[PDB]
């Protein structure tokens, strides 16, 4: 039913693929049962990795999330069939190759990442690993897609005390106290991501810098943008903006549509 190409991607395994039934580009992701720590049960109650549970919850309708087309269980692994846009580049390679992004471009990207995380939250899913590496850019359509829910969880309003995401994007309350709330931790990670986009790299590498609450701009960044980043990176969780507050921020106004973004910046 699928024709398996070559590796696309570390310690993970995602292959290029084409569905024989219609030559749809697919990505085929393999996950070892030995390395799955979080398990769940589906709408019908079969015991599956949480990643599958969360992909299913976010994968209906159109969105800025890579959609799970199907999945199979094997003796020692699960296989996941996912969307594959073409042509594509992840946001980390794109920032490495092009450097600090122009603000107009960062704005279109960031806005779309906001819509995609809103969509996850609305569906009951916390990704917990928002970062340039987990964002694909469809270079023709100018659309971003979130990937890799392998560190995610069901969204809840109570405190989280576990976390297997990327440390340099984790908030100071996690570093200092081994606890966080979902949304407010998500917003912190989005402030790291925004800095990453407009400065060409993330702002912190060491714990002490994360907990330190000091944001140095290494590039010229407009002051409405600096203010949004600094707001998202408030040390105290309750001082961070809500998603609505991020999207109503003056830096966020007059966002380009995706085609426009593709035509102006990607083609």
């Amino acid at each position: 039913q699928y024709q398996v190409g070559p590796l696309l991607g570390g310690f993970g395994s995602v292959y290029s693929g084409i569905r024989v039934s219609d030559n749809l580009p697919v990505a085929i992701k393999h996950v070892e049962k030995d390395r799955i720590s979080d398990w769940g049960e589906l709408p019908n109650g079969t015991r599956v990795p949480m990643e599958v549970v969360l992909l299913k919850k976010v994968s209906s309708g159109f969105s800025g999330v890579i959609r799970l087309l199907d999945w199979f269980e094997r003796p020692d692994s699960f296989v996941l069939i996912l969307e594959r846009p073409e042509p594509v580049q992840d946001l980390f390679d794109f920032i490495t190759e092009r450097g600090a992004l122009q603000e107009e471009l960062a704005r279109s990207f960031f806005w779309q990442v906001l819509e995609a995380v809103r969509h996850c939250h609305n569906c009951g899913v916390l990704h917990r690993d928002i970062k340039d590496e987990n964002i694909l850019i469809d270079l023709n359509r100018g659309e971003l897609k979130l990937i890799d829910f392998g560190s995610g969880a069901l969204l809840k309003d109570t405190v989280y005390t576990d976390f297997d995401g990327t440390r340099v994007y984790s908030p100071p309350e996690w570093i200092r106290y081994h606890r966080y709330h979902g949304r407010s931790a998500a917003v912190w990670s989005l402030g790291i991501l925004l800095y990453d986009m407009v400065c060409g790299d993330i702002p912190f590498e060491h714990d002490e810098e994360i907990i330190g609450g000091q944001v140095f701009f290494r590039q010229r960044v407009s002051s409405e943008c600096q203010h949004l980043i600094r707001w998202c990176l408030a040390l105290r969780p309750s001082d961070r903006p809500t998603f609505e507050e991020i999207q109503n921020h003056p830096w966020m106004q007059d966002v380009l549509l995706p085609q426009e973004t593709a035509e102006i910046h990607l083609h």
């Binding site: 570390g10 310690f11 590496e133 392998g150 297997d164 340099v168 994007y169 060409g200 790299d201």
Partner: peptide, 7 residues
């Protein structure tokens, strides 16, 4: 100086 960071 710029690098990826695994989960």
């Amino acid at each position: 100086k710029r690098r990826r960071h695994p989960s």
